[PDB]
Amino acid sequence: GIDINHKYDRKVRRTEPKSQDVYLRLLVKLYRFLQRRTNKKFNRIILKRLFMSKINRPPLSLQRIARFFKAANQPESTIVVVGTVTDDARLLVVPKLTVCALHVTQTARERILKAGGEVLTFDQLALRSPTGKNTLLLQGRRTARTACKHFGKAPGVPHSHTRPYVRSKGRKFERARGRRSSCGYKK
Amino acid sequence: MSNIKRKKTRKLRGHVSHGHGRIGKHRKHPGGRGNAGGMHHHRINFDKYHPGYFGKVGMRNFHLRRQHKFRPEINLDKLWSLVGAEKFAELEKEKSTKAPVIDLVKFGYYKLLGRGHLPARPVIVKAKYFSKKAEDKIKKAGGVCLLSA
Amino acid sequence: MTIRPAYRPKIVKKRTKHFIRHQSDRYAKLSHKWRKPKGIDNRVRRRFKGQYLMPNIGYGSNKRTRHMLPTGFKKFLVHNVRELEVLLMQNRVYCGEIAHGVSSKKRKEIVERAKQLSVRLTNPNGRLRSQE
RNA sequence: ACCUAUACAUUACCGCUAAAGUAGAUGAUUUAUAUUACUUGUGAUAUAAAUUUUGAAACUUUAGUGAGUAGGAAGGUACAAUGGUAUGCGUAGAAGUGUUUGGCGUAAGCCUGCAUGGAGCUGCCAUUGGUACAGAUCUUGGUGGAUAGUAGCAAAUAAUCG
């Protein structure tokens, strides 16, 4: 009369990446061997960070790689990004580093290699630094996405700045009754 | 593409009521077709979620041909992306036979917009329409806006 | 005779009787092939005593006795000679079970090959025959 | 004192959840010994013997729990088609089908034997659906009990010898 083995016992989190990708799982298999065998949390979270859905993995841009350099105690640093690395045109001066990433966009590979940096695969970062020495783990901006805006769509409670789900933006598209004090009510 | 083998409707055979509840059975148009009654039954659902639904914000513009107004925008965030990448580093040089004369108009953007903060390097921007603020930061960078066909 | 596959714990068949579907003995339209009673009136679904047994997982055989024929040999559907040759190393877990679509002339080869390999065949008397 | 629920205790076993390891094999590990180094006793090396080729998108290993309509998700099973494949099967008998053949799986269902048969057919990985029936006062065809005869085949007499 089990008081109470109700819930939750199904939990939460992926053992293994939800991906057919034969490459991706080899990295997981590699870092999974490196986890308990060499202690240290860099192995523990990079294993997890490969599990990650495409959302929660949103593309890290090259100017974000260049602002991290301005950080104290960071000049000798091989920047880790478990992610797609995207080219930012606006950074005039791209600093030297070796950057280790899952994927680097071809325009981003040219501005790293011009710097003159190396674009590196995680398996060669694992060889270099199995102790994660002089890394820096960067995670992308998830707040950017159009989906995040829409959540919380509520009128009443003095909120939202949420974006109504609108196919077309203009006058005669949801400007009227309920957006403004004039046509009855303020949002 | 498609498998009905991945459909769960396949799985729901049989399950007698196929996920469509025994008591209240899914029967053709239970809530009235479409946006009906949006002043009545769905009033909760419209102001929630679409609120500006219904009335007017009237200024009826009979025969807006969207060629007069079209005006696409480039920001002063970006603006240096009109300059080809291997020339972009080439005019950071420092060498002056200058200043940087970018033809915004043939890059198809009618209007140069304000957005702010470019490098101190002087830019002349050849543009039809001006943000006064875009010009203000360009003039601070020591260039100009030369106003353009 | 033929030497049995790898020391099994005695195969508990645990419920033996074909589940038969509720009221197959009432109706020839209702096939003995099990179909679970979903329905609101079911005394079977509420598992009243004396309304048979619904396939519940706990009739489930030990994962060691899983597949074993009681002369040990698990069933491999053997289409021909090359197919037979797979179970040369795997005498002691598998038996060649000649598919019914196979002709006698090939069966004579399969049975002959099977004796060489010393892998059990479950059905030899398959298609034999005082016949051409 | 005794009796006794799927409760309760323990145990084997199913599943689901949990929790941990597993992924140096030109290598590792165990065992015995000869030699050598140090030391009492241990390691190195040589030799001989033995184990180890892991769906590492699983196994080994572990513990706690399971009513269940509506419903949701997860994983299979069957059916027709298609790309590929098994140098697949096949008139020496295919498919189909009857079947106290034998067996497998909790099941969905599978294979096989035997009989019948006569011309074509299937497994696996992906790929698409007019995809699985007991019902719908379902449809269409067939068939029972009623009933080899019960209603009846009786109004206008109704023949009959032959």
Add this chain to the structure above:
RNA sequence: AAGAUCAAGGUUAUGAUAUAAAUGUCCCAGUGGGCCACUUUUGGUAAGCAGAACUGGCGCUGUGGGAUGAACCAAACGUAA
């Protein structure tokens, strides 16, 4: 008064616990006809009646028990010794 900078502090200042919890998305089904009992109660003489409050069941629940039984009692059911 807030933001708040700086320095001081033995033991973190009830008790059991955490089946890990919090958080977001789906705007998801299913539901919008309840029924019964302890207790508390209103209408009604009352009702297997109409209607609340709190809580549990039944609805979705057999099994053992009340001879019997949707609901009461005991108890929540993988398969067996």
Add this chain to the structure above:
RNA sequence: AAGUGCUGAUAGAUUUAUAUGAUUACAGUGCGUUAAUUUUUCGGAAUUAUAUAAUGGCAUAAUUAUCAUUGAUUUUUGUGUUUAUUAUAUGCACUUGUAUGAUUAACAAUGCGAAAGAUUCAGGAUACCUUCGGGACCCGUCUUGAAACACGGACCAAGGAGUCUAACAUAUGUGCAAGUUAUUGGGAUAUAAACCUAAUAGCGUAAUUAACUUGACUAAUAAUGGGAUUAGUUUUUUAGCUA
């Protein structure tokens, strides 16, 4: 309250212990320290005779808490005396010794694999028959509740019902990514495919006001700034542990 000593019966006994994982620990017995007493009186066995540590019991002293002081009890510490008890100083060889965390087997009997052929034994709710007990009311359904004196359904076979499409939201995968989508069309063909792809256009890259309009400032940078909670890393400094 004492494993002081002890008997019966019941059910269970995964044992793939190298699939890719352990077999380790203890004990007995022998070995080579001695003596003395006792019992059997043969083989042996016990107890006593050391050092070390702990513990209880005696006496004494201090603290600290407490019942009240006649006297006790507590927590802590020290000291002296004697005695008992327990652990350490008990290694190596061998061992069918105990356990090694699901430790069923010593030991034995019987059937029997007896070539093909095929005896004999054990075991079974296959179909189905039999014999015994117990349980089993008709499904589907609406309904609070269905075995209902609720409704459909005599019986059986086969058709037979959550789809396709346009447009949409969310989850996810895939491609590329500050861009993307070629397939309107053209080039081409092994042909309604594949391969190539001019040019636009769509959406995104600025929004908001009705619209006119104007323009997110700061900085090359500041992932919005500052601030507070947050990971991960580098990093000052120190401690412990392991190598």
Add this chain to the structure above:
RNA sequence: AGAGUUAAACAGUACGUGAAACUGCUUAGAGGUUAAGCCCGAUGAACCUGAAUAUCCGUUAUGGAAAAUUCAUCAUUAAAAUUGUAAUAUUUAAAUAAUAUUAUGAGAAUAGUGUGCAUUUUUUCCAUAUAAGGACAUUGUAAUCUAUUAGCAUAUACCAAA
């Protein structure tokens, strides 16, 4: 009904194949306890399925019989590969690394010869042996283990009252 024909009339004009419902017959069995139908447990009948080997304290010791020749203890000869290393080219200029080509050294084996190619060895067979011819199956006893039930026999402590 015989017969002919046909590979088959188990294809003889509902004619390929051949279902279910349903019915007749035959075969088995029973029949007053719910009308009948049903599940489980025990149980009989028909019917079927499963069925193993070497050891006390070990299966090694020993003896005989046959056969082998790169290896057999190993040497030589030939054949090609592997381990490690280097070069020259390519890959990535260059490095490490990898790859193609080439070369060297360490070795191991496939064939040939050789003490022997049964001097002997080794390989392969057979017999005999210690409790015993055994462990598939079912059985006996006893020792244990886990859960448990039910006694036995031994001895105290304290409190009240006495």
